[PDB]
Amino acid sequence: MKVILLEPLENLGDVGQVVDVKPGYARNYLLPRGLAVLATESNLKALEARIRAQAKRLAERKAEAERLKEILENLTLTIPVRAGETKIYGSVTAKDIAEALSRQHGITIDPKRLALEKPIKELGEYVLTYKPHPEVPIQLKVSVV
Amino acid sequence: PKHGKRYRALLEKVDPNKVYTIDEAARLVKELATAKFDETVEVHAKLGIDPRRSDQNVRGTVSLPHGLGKQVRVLAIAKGEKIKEAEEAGADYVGGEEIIQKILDGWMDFDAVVATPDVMGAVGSKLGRILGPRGLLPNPKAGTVGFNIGEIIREIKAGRIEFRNDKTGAIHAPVGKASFPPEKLADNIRAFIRALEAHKPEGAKGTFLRSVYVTTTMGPSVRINPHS
Amino acid sequence: SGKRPIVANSIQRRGKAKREGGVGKKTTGISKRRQYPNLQKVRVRVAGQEITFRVAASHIPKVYELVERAKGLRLEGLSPKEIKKELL
RNA sequence: GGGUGAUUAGCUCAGCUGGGAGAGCACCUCCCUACAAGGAGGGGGUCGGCGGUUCGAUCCCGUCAUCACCCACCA
RNA sequence: GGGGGCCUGACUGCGAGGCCUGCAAGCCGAGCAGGGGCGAAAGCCGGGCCUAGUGAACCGGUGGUCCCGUGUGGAAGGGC
RNA sequence: GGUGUUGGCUCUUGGUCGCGCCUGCGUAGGAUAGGUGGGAGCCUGUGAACCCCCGCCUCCGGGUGGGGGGGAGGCGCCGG
Ligand SMILES: [Mg+2]
Ligand SMILES: [Mg+2]
Ligand SMILES: [Mg+2]
Ligand SMILES: [Mg+2]
Ligand SMILES: [Mg+2]
């Protein structure tokens, strides 16, 4: 019986590979226990359209970065903040790093989608690693005075 | 010593289980064999029957375009006007029933039968059991058929072939001779099976096909695919 | 009874006997006998509860067809017997 | 008909996947004992006939014949 | 009736006329052609000196046959 | 008995048909010569013979093979 499973039981294969099984193996086991589906022409091109989505979805969410990767890196970021002259008075936070784009460069980027475990307290034209998607690592240029 | 190391030779350059095309393939079979100063055909093929079922003994004769080559001596045996009309070639200096003890103790160097079943009462007594299964007994369908023997000792120069299929299908085309061009090794497998496809055994549940191979006295082996 | 999408049932069609021949003649022996389908119960879930089907082995998956059809179907209302009836 | 099987002395019987037919009982006699135990000699066979392979058949193979078992095909 | 020789006429295609008799049968049979046996020829040979030694029809096997053979060509089955 | 109801996991066993492999034992005759048909060369200097291990069968006689530095000859003709 041609049926596809969704939990990789290392006896009939990994998820995705349809397999012919004895009907009883499917009648009194899989589908009741939520292991497989009767892959009909309806339930074929059903989920076949699904794999026609996510496998193609990574494009309006993937290349959308590259249309900004080799663009965003071609810029600086300046955060004028009164401070000491070898260590900042206070700090600069990723949460606050984002709106620095809004008060100068007018771009909306996500906070916690940014590699910065701790805040920076000393100056220097430093460069960070922003993430718009865990696939296209972009390095971000910043500076404080 | 053991088994030899050249046997692990020519076969690596033959591709055993394949095709070849048989006919036009014999032309490089010529450089396959490379035996001594000769070559044979060796067809064999084992029947799909049983040694018994009454007595499907089977005998016959073959044609063969050119012929054999060397000698079988023949010698033969009769009494009267028999060898009289048969001594231009294969037979010579026979004598009579005062010589057969040269079979006993005189001249030991004999082969080929012809002759005529005219004095069987004595050879069926003296050589009636202790000679035959080598490939003898005057017999009929074996070069011993009355006055018709007149067209036989020159038919040696044509064909022999004893249809002794026995327990093992057997049969064996032995006329190649290598240096007899390759033509004498190319245009006769068909005319061989044409006489082999003759008085076959009758009533058998199976096939009349096996192996065939076509090999020399010491040539390669491993199948061929028999058809044409 | 027979019931179920098979719409199958029992038939009385005759069972007979003939001692062989054909190269001579063939005998006779008759009687009337009953033929039955191969109906068996069929368990299935459908979200809530189970429900049995005295269906024949011809049209077993038709239920699994029917079930796999009843996706976006208002299936509940606390009505298990009524569900089977509503199964198309 | 289809297939499994036998059959050897007078008898109940071996022979071994091929190579001079044999062990018991019965029959004749000789022994030690008078009987019957028990030994030694000899006779006894168409391996059911007929054939084919085999150098060579009790055995390999194929019909007959007298059985025995099982499944019909007889208008 | 007892011996010997040569043979296959215990042929094929017909077959007038008749015995018996309800039907079906059964029985004898001269005559011709094809071809043959015997005998020098006349001639005889279509089983046996005779009267008993047998089985309608239905069904089916085997061998031949200018036959029929389903839209047509083979084939399958049938028919003589 | 077979099959659908009837599903997962596993151990083993018989046979059929090919392949790669182990054998083939009266005397005589080196000797343990399955059969048939050819067959005089065959192997060998990319490797033989006198020398160590092992396996299988075995008729104690050996038949068959993967192994060792050694490196020029050994079986077949024929006889019997
Ligand atoms: Mg000759
Ligand atoms: Mg020819
Ligand atoms: Mg019912
Ligand atoms: Mg029939
Ligand atoms: Mg059952």
From Swiss-Prot, chain A:
Role: Binds to the 23S rRNA.
Name assigned to this protein: Large ribosomal subunit protein bL9
GO biological process, one term: translation
InterPro entries in alphabetical order: Ribosomal_bL9 (IPR000244), Ribosomal_bL9/RNase_H1_N (IPR009027), Ribosomal_bL9_bac/chp (IPR020594), Ribosomal_bL9_C (IPR020069), Ribosomal_bL9_C_sf (IPR036791), Ribosomal_bL9_N (IPR020070), Ribosomal_bL9_N_sf (IPR036935)
GO cellular component entries: ribonucleoprotein complex; ribosome
Source organism, top-level taxon: Bacteria
Family as reported in the entry's similarity comment: Belongs to the bacterial ribosomal protein bL9 family.
Keywords from the named record: Ribonucleoprotein, Ribosomal protein, RNA-binding, rRNA-binding
SUPFAM superfamilies: L9 N-domain-like (SSF55658), Ribosomal protein L9 C-domain (SSF55653)
Pfam families listed in its UniProt record: Ribosomal_L9_C, Ribosomal_L9_N
Gene Ontology molecular function terms on file: rRNA binding; structural constituent of ribosome
UniProtKB/Swiss-Prot annotation, chain C:
Keyword annotations of the record: Ribonucleoprotein, Ribosomal protein
A Pfam family it matches: Ribosomal_L28
Keyword Oxidoreductase: no
GO cellular component: ribonucleoprotein complex; ribosome
GO biological process entries: translation
GO MF annotations, alphabetized: structural constituent of ribosome
NCBIfam families per record: L28 (TIGR00009)
Family: Belongs to the bacterial ribosomal protein bL28 family.
Record's protein name: Large ribosomal subunit protein bL28
Origin species: Thermus thermophilus (strain ATCC BAA-163 / DSM 7039 / HB27)
Gene transcribed to yield this protein: rpmB
